[PDB]
């Protein structure tokens, strides 16, 4: 709990000093995934193969 609370406090202290406008830029913009329904005919091997 103390390592949790001290972390929270130093996070919010930075969010005040540095301002809440750059701290969102520290959180990386993660990528949402979509579905990629293809049709994908059976894969043709090469001739010599």
């Amino acid at each position: 709990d103390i390592r949790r609370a001290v972390s929270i406090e130093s996070a919010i202290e930075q969010k005040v000093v540095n301002g809440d406008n750059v701290d969102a830029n520290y959180s990386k913009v993660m990528v949402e995934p979509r579905a990629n329904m293809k049709f994908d005919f059976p894969t043709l091997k090469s001739y010599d193969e």
Binding site: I2, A5, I12, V16, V17, G19
Partner: protein, 170 residues
Amino acid sequence: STKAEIKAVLNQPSGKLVEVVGTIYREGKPVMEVTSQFLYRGEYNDYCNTFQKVTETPVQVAFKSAKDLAVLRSKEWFHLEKDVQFDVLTFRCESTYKFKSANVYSSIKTTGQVLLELPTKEVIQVGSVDYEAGTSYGNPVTDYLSRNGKTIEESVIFENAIPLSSGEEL
């Protein structure tokens, strides 16, 4: 006699506010304080010669769990000089802002005292508060005092005000 010092010089959107407080003296002892407030109406961007000195509301933070005592002891701006256990602490602080733009503070020097209420009703300062930074967006000490503790407020307000006299005789 009269001694007065200037406190607030800040470029508001409406102009250059100036606040002065005058501590009037009588045989050396100060008698009363007069706080005036002017305004150079218009527009001014001299964000270099602007500043502000404010004394903070004395906040009373109560320590109950064991992390709390470590919480502030982690704060490099907090600095206790007496190793005595404490339950509740009153923070009487003052700050000195120096602005760099509308809302960025080119400097913040916020010193203040932390006080402990003994059962003997004798109040002994546990330590000092010494914050100092540049290009900040708020006073961390004041914020931390606000959310994690209540102030020693003096203006207790009624839930319903009362009219003193009614009519037009005023």
